[PDB]
Design a protein around this ligand. Sequence first.
Ligand SMILES: [Mg+2]
Ligand SMILES: [Mg+2]
Ligand SMILES: [Zn+2]
Ligand SMILES: [Zn+2]
Lengths: 251, 251, 172, 172
Amino acid sequence: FLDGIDKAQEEHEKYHSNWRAMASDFNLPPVVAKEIVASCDKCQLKGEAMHGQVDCSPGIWQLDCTHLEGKVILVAVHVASGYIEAEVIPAETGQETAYFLLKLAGRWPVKTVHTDNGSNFTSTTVKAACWWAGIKQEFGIPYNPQSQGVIQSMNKELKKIIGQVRDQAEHLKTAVQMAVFIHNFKRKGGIGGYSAGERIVDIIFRVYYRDSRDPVWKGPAKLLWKGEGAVVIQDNSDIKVVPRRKAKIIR
Amino acid sequence: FLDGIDKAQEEHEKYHSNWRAMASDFNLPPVVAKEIVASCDKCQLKGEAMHGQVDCSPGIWQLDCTHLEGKVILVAVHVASGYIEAEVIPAETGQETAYFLLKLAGRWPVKTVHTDNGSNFTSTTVKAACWWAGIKQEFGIPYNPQSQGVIQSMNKELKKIIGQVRDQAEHLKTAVQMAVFIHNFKRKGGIGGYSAGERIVDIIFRVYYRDSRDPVWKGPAKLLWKGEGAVVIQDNSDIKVVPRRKAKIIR
Amino acid sequence: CSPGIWQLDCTHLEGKVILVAVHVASGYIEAEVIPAETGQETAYFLLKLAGRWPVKTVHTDNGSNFTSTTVKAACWWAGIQSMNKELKKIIGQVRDQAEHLKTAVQMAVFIHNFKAGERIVDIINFRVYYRDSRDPVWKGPAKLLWKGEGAVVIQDNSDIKVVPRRKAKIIR
Amino acid sequence: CSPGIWQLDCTHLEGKVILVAVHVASGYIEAEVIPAETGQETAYFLLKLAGRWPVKTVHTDNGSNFTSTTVKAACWWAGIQSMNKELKKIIGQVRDQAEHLKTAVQMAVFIHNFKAGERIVDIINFRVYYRDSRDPVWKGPAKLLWKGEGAVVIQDNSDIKVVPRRKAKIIR
DNA sequence: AAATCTCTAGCAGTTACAGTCAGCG
DNA sequence: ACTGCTAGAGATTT
DNA sequence: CGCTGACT
DNA sequence: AAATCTCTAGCAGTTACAGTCAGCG
DNA sequence: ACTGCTAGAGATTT
DNA sequence: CGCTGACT
Ligand SMILES: [Mg+2]
Ligand SMILES: [Mg+2]
Ligand SMILES: [Zn+2]
Ligand SMILES: [Zn+2]
């Protein structure tokens, strides 16, 4: 093509220059510069720089645990209304969770549950429970907590409220349900200045990626599917999902 | 005033409601509602939600260390040009740093240094050095790394470049200075598409707060001074600085 | 009839206590296994219902687990036979479907309530809030022109829009 | 004369090696204590200067620490007497001001260079970039109308502005 | 005052331990 | 074959 | 010389 | 194509260990 | 008495 | 019964 290209590829393969550097230095255009950059493997680390949007449907209920004063709280949430069904778990295991989902189905219309791939929520007991109750068990990415993001924020506010009213109890579970009362009925804002009971009642290629807490971005893999927020891929019959923030596509 | 106010203060002092709740529920205006909220101590946690702007003057030079492969790197930076003077430290102590600042004064015009309150940079050796060289030693907040933010980002890119060219060496310090070459002369962008040598040569009340990694926000204290980004305060002759993101003022 | 009316009761199935609240004006039932007769788990229960539904009044008797001053304090802070036997018979039905009793208790409460939920919904044109692609800001009141399945037909001030149900909320 | 010209040399003060590069066309000197005569610390030194200044050419002799192929490889990747005695005399002066020799070496380099810096600046109207309050975006080319002390007088397309020097950069 | 932008902490499984040195006894 | 968010605090315009 | 606390 | 918004990871002193359970031997 | 930032990657308008 | 790995 032009010997500037060859020396640009030697230059690049010694220094890994960016596209502006090779382009302006060796008097080249930006396109072929970005093709030399994009032809490289090592330089392709950073991802797409964009969050998604969690599914906000009436029949969805987020679910996750947290930790406080040595105790393990479980928290159920409605995506739309910000409502809470929180309680203390005496010791986290799957059976107690299944009993809790039975408790949440007997009070609130549940259709499907969106939580993480934690130990409990994959057990068979939970599966039999949501099976009996006509509830669809959905999961998300393991190492992308923001996929559950809604519930995570609730923990903050829940803990925040426990900062205010822990001196009004001799036990934890009491103050927990007190915080639930405050957040669901006594605090207002958001939609139109409603508390969560008012809202909840009103409603009712070459693709590089990383995972596994491994900052070593992965080699080329075969894109299977593109949606809005995550994608599905194949690296030697390794069918897997990746969120777009943690991935890059080479057309 | 109005008995709605008294029951609003009982309500608040039992549930710590927000201003919209008391306001709409007990049929009150938002101002006195926010005065009941602002009259409270516990509810006043969150801060001001705003970053500042680091001083970007020619005579400033950021300075900080980092860690890699068991070794402790030291990094000097120019705020304006993005230029680097990086090297390996064989074992971090203050004397070696003072020798490094002497090395950086004998090559580059230094006027003042902006780094953190780490062990080294407070020793007397550094003070004698910048004393001899006419360099002013400035410090920042302890637990606000973003005050040095510039240099922190450099470490990322520096480490990023070491991801690309670590296979071109039998030793670390070599690849370090190689990365320095790449970033300062061979990469371009930012201002007008310059590399850092081109730029560097072209140039040449009641106030609640927290610190100490302590999420317990502090009781009322007497504001001494207000600037743009941080403030100075007094809690029983405890004269101290706080950044505004970690503080709240009650007029 | 008033919405904030709850009738309380308890039974002793399998020699184990079960404590039940009933929304009178809808017959809506929540029953939970209480381990022990006392004001502690009682006030725990009314504290749950307090933050699970808008209680204003509980109708109950002179039992010792109810006259306990812990009840009066937690409630100060907070501000039918044929149903007992209904849930008794349903528990009899689904007892062999689940080993633990508490399980089948909540299964009977589930059966009665859904197999009264929409009744309490009935006790208490439309406005729509929505999000576009790559703009997590929630958007203004949108005049609902049609509610579909998987998509919805809205109108803002200048744009009749399609939005999938995964990015919408419909509130009066 | 060319800017990318560096003359190399070494001396042995206190029985310790010192390696010095000199910008010929400005006489600008950087001298560093090398622990041992070899191509390793040498190529380390030219690798530093390579990323500290835009080298194109080094003029040097047939010493073994220079003909070492490590020099040729690191340099392939990379692409006066009266000064030696000048720094020798200055080192003689400030030797008693600092215990370690390397210290006083860099003190002499400091003395010579600043007490040649602005010479290399001289080897290689104005445009101004600025930031307002609570808007970390960097702003467009602003026509410098006056450079002050602690503040500067700029002009954008419609607003002659004051900006403190702590929020400005002035580049040709 | 009354609305309407604009923006950030902390939530995410979680910390007791290392490394230095000015200052006080 | 899936997806970041929430509640305050402060400017700023009606 | 300890060693403390203070920040990293 | 050539510019000009718009937005996010990781940098910040740093991790090897706990807690469960579906699945495979 | 002091203050978050940088470099890419992707839409989008000239 | 181990125990592995996998996610939290
Ligand atoms: Mg979780
Ligand atoms: Mg630091
Ligand atoms: Zn490259
Ligand atoms: Zn309060």
